[PDB]
Every structure is written in C-alpha cells, then in structure tokens.
Amino acid sequence: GIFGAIAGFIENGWEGMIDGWYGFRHQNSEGTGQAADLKSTQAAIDQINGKLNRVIEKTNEKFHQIEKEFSEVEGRIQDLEKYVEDTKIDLWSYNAELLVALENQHTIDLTDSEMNKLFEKTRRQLRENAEDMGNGCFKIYHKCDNACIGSIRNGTYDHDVYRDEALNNRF
Amino acid sequence: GIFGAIAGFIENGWEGMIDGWYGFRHQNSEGTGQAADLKSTQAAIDQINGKLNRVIEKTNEKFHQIEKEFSEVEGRIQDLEKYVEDTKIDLWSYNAELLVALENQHTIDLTDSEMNKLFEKTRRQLRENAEDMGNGCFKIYHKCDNACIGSIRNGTYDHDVYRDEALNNRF
Amino acid sequence: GIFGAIAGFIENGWEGMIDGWYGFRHQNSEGTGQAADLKSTQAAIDQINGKLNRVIEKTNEKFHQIEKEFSEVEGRIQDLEKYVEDTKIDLWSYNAELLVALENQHTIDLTDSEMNKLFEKTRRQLRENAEDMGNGCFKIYHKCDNACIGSIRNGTYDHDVYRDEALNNRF
Amino acid sequence: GATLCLGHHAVPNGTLVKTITNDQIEVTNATELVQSSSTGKICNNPHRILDGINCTLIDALLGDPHCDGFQNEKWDLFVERSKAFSNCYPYDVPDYASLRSLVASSG
Amino acid sequence: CSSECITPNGSIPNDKPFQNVNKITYGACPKYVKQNTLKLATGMRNVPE
Ligand SMILES: *[C@@H]1O[C@H](CO)[C@@H](O[C@@H]2O[C@H](CO)[C@@H](O[C@@H]3O[C@H](CO)[C@@H](O)[C@H](O)[C@@H]3O)[C@H](O)[C@H]2NC(C)=O)[C@H](O)[C@H]1NC(C)=O
Ligand SMILES: *[C@@H]1O[C@H](CO)[C@@H](O[C@@H]2O[C@H](CO)[C@@H](O)[C@H](O)[C@H]2NC(C)=O)[C@H](O)[C@H]1NC(C)=O
Ligand SMILES: *[C@@H]1O[C@H](CO)[C@@H](O)[C@H](O)[C@H]1NC(C)=O
Ligand SMILES: *[C@@H]1O[C@H](CO)[C@@H](O)[C@H](O)[C@H]1NC(C)=O
Ligand SMILES: *[C@@H]1O[C@H](CO)[C@@H](O)[C@H](O)[C@H]1NC(C)=O
Ligand SMILES: *[C@@H]1O[C@H](CO)[C@@H](O)[C@H](O)[C@H]1NC(C)=O
Numbered sequence: 164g165i166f167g168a169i170a171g172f173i174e175n176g177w178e179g180m181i182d183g184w185y186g187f188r189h190q191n192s193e194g195t196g197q198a199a200d201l202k203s204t205q206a207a208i209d210q211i212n213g214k215l216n217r218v219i220e221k222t223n224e225k226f227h228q229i230e231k232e233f234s235e236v237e238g239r240i241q242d243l244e245k246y247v248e249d250t251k252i253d254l255w256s257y258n259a260e261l262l263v264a265l266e267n268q269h270t271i272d273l274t275d276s277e278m279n280k281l282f283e284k285t286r287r288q289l290r291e292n293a294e295d296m297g298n299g300c301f302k303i304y305h306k307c308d309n310a311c312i313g314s315i316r317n318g319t320y321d322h323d324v325y326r327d328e329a330l331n332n333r334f
Numbered sequence: 335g336i337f338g339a340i341a342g343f344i345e346n347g348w349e350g351m352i353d354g355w356y357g358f359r360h361q362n363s364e365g366t367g368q369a370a371d372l373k374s375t376q377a378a379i380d381q382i383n384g385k386l387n388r389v390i391e392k393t394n395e396k397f398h399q400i401e402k403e404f405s406e407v408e409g410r411i412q413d414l415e416k417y418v419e420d421t422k423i424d425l426w427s428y429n430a431e432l433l434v435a436l437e438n439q440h441t442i443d444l445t446d447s448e449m450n451k452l453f454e455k456t457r458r459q460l461r462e463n464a465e466d467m468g469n470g471c472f473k474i475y476h477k478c479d480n481a482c483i484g485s486i487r488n489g490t491y492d493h494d495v496y497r498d499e500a501l502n503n504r505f
Numbered sequence: 506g507i508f509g510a511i512a513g514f515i516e517n518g519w520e521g522m523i524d525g526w527y528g529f530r531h532q533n534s535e536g537t538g539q540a541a542d543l544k545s546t547q548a549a550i551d552q553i554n555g556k557l558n559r560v561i562e563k564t565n566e567k568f569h570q571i572e573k574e575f576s577e578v579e580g581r582i583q584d585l586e587k588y589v590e591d592t593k594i595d596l597w598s599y600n601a602e603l604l605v606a607l608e609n610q611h612t613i614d615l616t617d618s619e620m621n622k623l624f625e626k627t628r629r630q631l632r633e634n635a636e637d638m639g640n641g642c643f644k645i646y647h648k649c650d651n652a653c654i655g656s657i658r659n660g661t662y663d664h665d666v667y668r669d670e671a672l673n674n675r676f
Numbered sequence: 677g678a679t680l681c682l683g684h685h686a687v688p689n690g691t692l693v694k695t696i697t698n699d700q701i702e703v704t705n706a707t708e709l710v711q712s713s714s715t716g717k718i719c720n721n722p723h724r725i726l727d728g729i730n731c732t733l734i735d736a737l738l739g740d741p742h743c744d745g746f747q748n749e750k751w752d753l754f755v756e757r758s759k760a761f762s763n764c765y766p767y768d769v770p771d772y773a774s775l776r777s778l779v780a781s782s783g
Numbered sequence: 784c785s786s787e788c789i790t791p792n793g794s795i796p797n798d799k800p801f802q803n804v805n806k807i808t809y810g811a812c813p814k815y816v817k818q819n820t821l822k823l824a825t826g827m828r829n830v831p832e
Contacts, residue, residue: 164828165614165615165618166618167618167622167625167626168684169684169827169828169830170828170830171622172625172626172629173682173683173684174830174832175686175830175831175832176683176684176685176686176687176827176829176830176831177683177684177685177686178685178686178687178688178831180683180685180686181685183685184684184685184826184827185682185683185684185685186683186684186685187680187681187682187683188681188683189678189679189680189681190678190679191678191679192678207827211825211826215707215823215825217435218709218800218823219707219709219798219799219800220800221811222788222797222800222811222812222813222814223424223811223812223814224787224810224811224812225420225808225809225810225812226809226810227413227777227780227781228413228417229413229414229417230773230777231806231807232807239582240410240411240414240582242569242570242571243414243571243582243585243586243589244414246570246571246589247414247417247418247421247589248806250589250593251421251425252806252815252816252817253565253817254425254593254596254597254600255425255801255814255815255816256816256817256818257600258425258428259709259710259800259801259814259816259818259821260818260821261604262432263693263694263709263821263822263823264559264694264695264696265436265607265696266823266824267693267694267695267696267703267822267823267824268611268695268696268697268698269439270703270824270825270826270827271695271701271703271824271827271828272336273336274684274826274827274828275827275828276336276337276338278682278684278827279338280338280342281682282682283338283343284338284343284468285680285682287343287466287467287468288468289680290465290466291465291504293680294632294633295629295632296679297626297629297630298681299681299682299683300679300680300681300682301679301680301681301682302677302679303677303678303679303680304677305677305678306677306678307677307678307680311678312678312680315680329677330505332677333633334505334672334676388606394595398584399584399588400584400585400588407778408774408778409771409773409774409775409777409778410771410773410774410777411581411582411585411774413777414585415585418585418588418589418592422592422596425596426596429596429599433603436607440610443507444507447507447508447509451509451513454509454514455509455514455639458514458637458638458639459639461636461637462636462675501676505676551697552697552698553697555696555697555698555699556696556697558699559696559699608696611696615697684827686829686830686831687829688831690829690831691822691824691829692822693822693823693824694821694822695824701828702828702829703824703825703826703827703828703829704825704826704827704828704829705824705825705826706822706823706824706825706826707822707823707825708799708820708821708822708823709799709800709801709821709822709823710799710801710802710803710813710816710818710819710820710821711795711796711798711799711801711802711803711804711813712802712803712804712819712820713795713804714790714792714793714794714795714804715784715786715793715794715795716792716793717784717793717794718789718793718794719784719785719786719789719794720784721784721785721786722785722787723789723809723810725789753789753809
C-alpha cells in the first residue's frame with residue numbers, strides 16, 4: 164500500500180495464520196514458532212468496524228413521495244417529475260461509487276499502516292541486538308530461546324541484557 | 335494516527351508545552367530544558383488553515399426560489415416542490431457529514447505525520463552518535479551541553495565532531 | 506508531502522532526469538553517474554493512470570430533458586423547473602471541486618510515498634555498509650565501482666561481501 | 677542467534693474490490709453495500725397494508741359497489757393491483773393524480 | 784412476515800446503505816442507485832505467494 168509493507172517488502176501473507184491478522188514467526192535454537200499479535204489485529208478490526216458502522220447505519224425513512232412511473236404521456240409536469248427523480252438517482256449513484264472507492268483505498272492503506280507499525284515497534288525494541296533483513300525479518304545476534312522471543316512479543320524485552328553478546332556477534 | 339507517532343510510540347502530549355505544537359525536551363549535564371519547534375508547528379497550522387479556508391469560504395447567494403411551506407393541501411405540484419426540496423437537503427446533509435469525516439481523519443493523520451517527520455529529521459541529524467529509545471527519545475552517547483542541544487534543534491549539529499566520543503561510548 | 510521525502514529531506518528534483526520519475530545519482534572512484542528507476546516510476550504512473558481512467562471514463566448519455574431557458578414569465582412551474590436545474594448544477598459543481606481537491610492531495614501524497622519507498626528499499630539493501638546522510642544520499646563505506654552501484658540499483662547487492670571492509674571504515 | 681519475522685495473514689479465497697487508483701484489487705474480505713434481491717412478498721408488518729384487490733383507491737373513495745368493503749378503511753400503505761376495475765357509472769377525475777395523492781396521504 | 788422497507792417488487796432488508804431493487808420505495812429504505820453491486824473492503828490486501 165502506501166507504506167510498502169503489505170504486498171511490500173513483506174513478500175506475502177500467511178494462509179497459515181488463522182488466529183490473528185498480524186503476527187510473528189520465529190526460528191531459534193529450540194525450533195520454529197508462530198504467534199498472533201492481538202493488539203494490532205484489534206487496531207485494524209476496530210477501525211474497519213468504525214467505518215463499517217458509519218456506512219451500514221440506519222437508512223432514511225420516507226413515506227409519501229412523487230410518482231416515479233407513468234401510464235400516460237402528459238408532457239411538461241411529467242418531464243419535470245421524471246427529470247427530478249433521474250437527477251437524484253444519478254447523484255446518489257455517484258456518492259456511492261465514490262464512497263466505496265475512497266473507503267477501500269483507505270482500508271488498504273490503514274491495514275498496511277498497522278503492519279508497518281508493528282514492524283517499527285519491534286525494530287525499536289530490539290535496539291542494537293538485531294538487524295533488518297529487509298524481508299520483514301530481523302536477525303537477532305544473540306541467543307534467543309522461546310522465553311526471550313516471547314518477551315519480544317509481549318513488549319518486555321530488555322536489550323541491555325543481551326547487548327554485549329549481540330554487539331560482539333554483530334561485529 | 336497512520337504513522338503511529340501521536341497516540342503512538344510517543345506516549346502522550348505535553349500540556350506544559352504552550353509555545354508550539356511540537357518540540358524538544360532535553361536532559362543533559364547542565365539541566366533539563368524545553369523548546370518549541372516552530373517550523374513544523376507552522377507546517378501543521380498552515381495545512382489546517384488551508385483546509386479551514388477551503389471550507390469556511392464564501393457561501394452561495396440565492397434570491398427568489400421555490401416556496402418550501404404550504405398552508406393548503408394541493409396534491410401533485412406541491413408533492414413535487416416538497417420532494418425536490420427534501421431531496422436537495424438530504425444530498426447536502428450527506429456532503430456535509432462526509433466532508434467533516436474525511437477532513438478530520440486527514441487532519442489527525444497529517445498532524446501525526448508532522449510529528450513523525452520531526453522525529454525522522456532529528457534521527458538523521460544525529461547519525462551514529464545516538465540511539466532510538468523507542469519512546470520518541472534519543473540517547474546521545476557523547477557529552478551534549480545546552481549549546482549542542484541547541485545546535486541539534488536549529489539543524490546545525492555536526493556529528494563528525496562527536497562521532498569518536500559517541501562511537502566509543504556506544505560500544 | 507505526507508512522508509516528507511519530496512519537497513522533504515530530498516532538497517529538490519532533478520530537471521536533468523528525463524528518462525524516469527525516480528532514480529539514482531552516484532559518485533565513486535570511476536566517476537559520476539545517473540540512472541532512472543523504472544519499477545517505481547511505473548508504480549506512480551500506473552496509479553495516476555488508474556485514477557485518470559476512473560475520472561475520464563464514459564460520460565452519461567441523456568436525451569430529452571426539461572427546458573432550461575424561458576422567454577415568458579410563467580410563475581410557479583417555471584420557478585420549479587429553474588430551481589431543480591440550479592440545484593442539480595450546484596451539487597455537481599460541488600462534486601467536481603471536491604473530486605479534484607481530494608484526488609490531487611492523494612496524488613501528491615502517493616508520489617511522495619513512492620520516493621520514500623525507493624529510499625527505504627535501498628537503505629535496507631545496504632545494511633551496515635552505508636549511512637543515511639539525511640539529504641536522501643547514502644554514504645557507502647567500502648569501495649563501490651560502477652558494477653557494484655549497478656548491483657545496488659538492480660537489487661542484487663550482496664552486503665556480506667563488503668561488510669568487513671565497510672564495518673572497518675565506519676568505525 | 678535467532679530470526680524474528682513480522683508478517684500479516686492471508687486467505688485462500690480473496691475478493692476483488694474497487695479503489696481510487698485501482699479498478700480490481702484483491703482484499704481478504706469485503707461486504708456488499710447494495711441490496712439487489714427481494715423475498716417477493718410485501719410484509720404485512722409493521723405497516724398497515726391495505727390490499728385493494730379489485731379496487732383502486734379512487735373507486736373505494738367514491739363508493740363503487742364492489743368496493744363497498746373499503747368503507748371507512750385505514751392504511752399506512754394502500755396497494756393498488758393491476759387487475760383492478762371499475763363497475764359503476766363511467767366517470768373521470770380532472771387532476772386524478774392529485775386526488776389520488778391527497779387521499780392516499782390522508783391515509 | 785416483517786420488514787421496514789416496501790418496494791413494488793416485495794419487501795427488502797434495510798441493513799445495507801443502498802439498493803438496486805426499485806426506485807419506488809416505502810418506509811426506511813436503502814437509497815436507490817444504479818449499481819447492482821458495490822463491495823466495501825473489510826480486510827487488507829490479500830497476497831498469497
Ligand atoms: C423489480 O421491479 C422492477 C420493475 O418491475 C424490475 O425492472 C424490470 O426488469 C426487467 C428485466 O430486467 C426490464 O426489462 C427490460 O425492459 C427494457 C425496456 O423496455 C427492454 O429494453 C429490455 O429488453 C428488458 O426487457 C424492465 O424494463 C424493468 N422494468 C422497469 C420499469 O424498470 C426489476 O427487475 C425488479 N427487480 C427485482 C429484484 O426483482
Ligand atoms: C375480483 O374480481 C374477479 C373478477 O371479476 C373475481 O373473480 C370472480 O370470482 C367469482 C366468484 O368466485 C367467479 O364466479 C368468477 O368466475 C370470477 N370472475 C372472473 C372474470 O374470473 C373475484 O371474485 C374478485 N375478488 C374479490 C376478492 O372480490
Ligand atoms: C512477557 O513474557 C515473560 C516471559 O514469558 C513473562 O514473564 C511476562 O509476564 C510477560 N509480560 C506480560 C506483561 O505479559
Ligand atoms: C544554531 O545554534 C548555534 C549555537 O547556539 C548558533 O551559533 C547558530 O547561529 C544557530 N544557527 C542558526 C542558523 O540559527
Ligand atoms: C544486476 O547487475 C549485475 C552486475 O552489473 C548483473 O550481473 C546482473 O545480471 C544484474 N541483475 C539483474 C537481475 O538484472
Ligand atoms: C467478512 O466481513 C463481514 C463484515 O465485516 C463479516 O461479517 C464476516 O465475518 C467476514 N468474513 C470472514 C470470513 O472474515
């Protein structure tokens with residue numbers, strides 16, 4: 164999208180991730196793992212819903228209106244009634260087409276945004292202990308077991324602990 | 335917002351900053367300080383005004399129009415006059431609601447943008463002499479007095495000067 | 506724009522670049538060079554066209570409508586015909602003004618986005634072997650001849666090759 | 677060391693939608709904003725529906741004998757059928773449309 | 784049965800913002816438009832592999 168993460172520097176999506184919209188796959192000494200990130204998944208879902216509720220909202224109630232069909236040719240007044248209805252329909256048809264186009268463009272961009280925000284958050288956590296591999300994966304230059312990975316995921320990772328090790332392995 | 339700076343990785347705003355929209359707080363050997371960034375404050379205000387002036391602009395002048403209230407039941411023509419007016423009001427009511435929603439979304443996003451741009455500008459200035467702490471604060475690994483901080487703020491900071499010192503302290 | 510690249514941290518555009526929208530200028534041992542990036546140029550052009558085709562698309566066909574001019578003063582019905590047409594014209598005039606404003610704002614933002622995306626892609630390629638000079642230029646800390654620059658441009662650059670050299674020269 | 681990958685999900689069956697820059701582009705899910713179908717029946721709740729059957733509203737108004745069932749009736753929505761017909765003295769209403777309207781509206 | 788929106792074709796559900804069924808309606812009704820479909824995206828760009 165506009166941030167270049169989804170269909171971006173992130174090659175493709177994971178059909179295998181069924182418990183969330185965004186998440187982590189990791190590989191460390193202990194094996195491989197996958198976990199969903201629920202906060203950012205929620206951010207996206209919440210926004211999309213907000214918008215869904217804006218649009219799907221109560222319609223307008225109308226009761227007696229002008230006649231829209233005619234069995235006789237009347238000339239002027241019917242010309243006018245017909246023209247008014249036709250005008251209205253064209254204008255609303257336009258509003259709807261555009262609403263959808265804008266809304267969709269924005270949804271695409273905001274979901275891309277959430278992805279990119281998770282990436283950024285994580286990179287910032289890792290400090291000097293990892294490098295950006297450009298594919299949306301970090302290379303972690305110290306020894307990271309499942310607990311450690313977890314600490315990255317739940318935001319409690321303490322970089323100063325591994326900094327020496329990692330710094331050593333980076334250079 | 336869409337860049338994740340405001341209400342983002344930046345925890346919250348400063349009620350104490352009354353001289354600008356965006357700024358720096360610093361802590362160094364000499365003490366603590368706060369200063370507003372006027373260029374980016376202006377960037378935001380200018381955009382918001384541009385938009386404010388687009389919307390608040392001259393209204394349309396109309397003089398003799400159709401009658402919108404009626405004391406007698408007339409049937410067809412009155413049905414039509416009523417329907418036309420009602421149609422118009424619904425359409426404009428829609429335009430207004432939407433204008434506000436879009437405009438507001440965009441204002442939120444563009445103010446977020448300005449913040450993030452200031453952050454990015456600064457990070458780029460500092461080069462290898464500082465690290466991103468993730469909270470919207472940089473850690474500066476050399477000795478920075480009030481003049482030096484100032485140089486960062488007014489964009490004249492020369493990193494090569496402190497690079498050796500900082501590089502030393504970083505690793 | 507919203508990413509702060511164009512009219513951003515990138516000082517200005519190159520009137521000298523006539524073969525693409527975005528590109529690289531380099532200076533190395535062998536001399537100076539300039540090359541266009543066709544993929545991102547295409548990304549921009551494609552989007553702009555998509556939009557151009559959305560708007561420039563087939564118009565609506567209308568045939569017999571109400572009369573919009575009058576040689577005699579008739580009162581009520583003419584008041585109504587006149588009012589309907591005037592209402593329609595004001596609403597479409599609004600749609601058009603807004604379409605243009607939004608679309609343009611977005612074009613500006615998306616072209617800025619493409620630039621920034623190219624920058625980001627490149628920075629990611631270079632890994633530890635270069636630094637962001639903040640002007641939209643990277644400083645490459647190893648010896649890069651025209652072939653090497655090319656490899657950066659066509660996305661085949663292998664950083665691990667030069668990492669030792671560059672790491673050495675950076676610190 | 678370890679590798680940590682950031683990712684987003686994807687699905688087997690995606691949906692084409694339309695955007696500002698793009699005519700068809702595939703997203704994971706979409707929802708339909710235009711109702712194109714009908715059950716086919718006029719639902720008798722929550723509106724008082726008066727089925728006119730062989731009677732038009734005007735004939736019901738005037739009192740054409742085969743319409744006499746409609747005397748003093750009320751409706752939120754009067755439904756006129758195509759099979760309706762007039763069995764009484766042949767007549768006409770100048771500005772038929774307006775009488776029909778204002779009575780229909782009085783309800 | 785029950786429904787808030789009546790058209791000459793029959794009743795229609797009012798849950799959506801728009802409808803292609805009939806320009807003639809009674810009650811609380813989706814606005815009428817010329818399109819038979821408009822999809823509003825409810826998720827991100829799908830990128831399989
Ligand atoms: C709901 O009701 C309306 C009105 O009964 C339906 O519209 C009608 O649909 C048919 C079939 O698409 C149209 O037939 C076409 O007529 C045109 C014009 O004469 C002719 O050139 C074509 O060859 C075609 O036969 C018909 O015009 C149209 N009637 C009106 C007045 O619009 C509609 O299909 C119904 N929708 C649902 C959900 O049932
Ligand atoms: C509506 O009018 C139709 C047609 O006049 C009526 O159908 C008639 O019904 C009677 C009694 O069942 C039959 O003997 C006739 O053969 C029918 N006539 C025709 C021409 O089909 C119908 O009864 C009327 N419906 C109501 C409820 O009044
Ligand atoms: C994060 O993970 C660690 C280790 O698994 C755990 O001890 C800690 O409670 C977690 N933090 C939170 C706030 O969930
Ligand atoms: C920035 O700060 C330095 C030191 O305080 C000062 O000498 C210099 O003039 C300032 N630069 C500008 C352009 O204001
Ligand atoms: C990129 O450049 C190198 C060296 O000039 C060349 O050998 C290689 O084929 C190029 N790669 C592609 C995919 O064009
Ligand atoms: C698709 O979106 C709709 C509306 O948001 C939702 O009700 C439905 O559960 C979604 N389908 C899937 C499989 O996510």
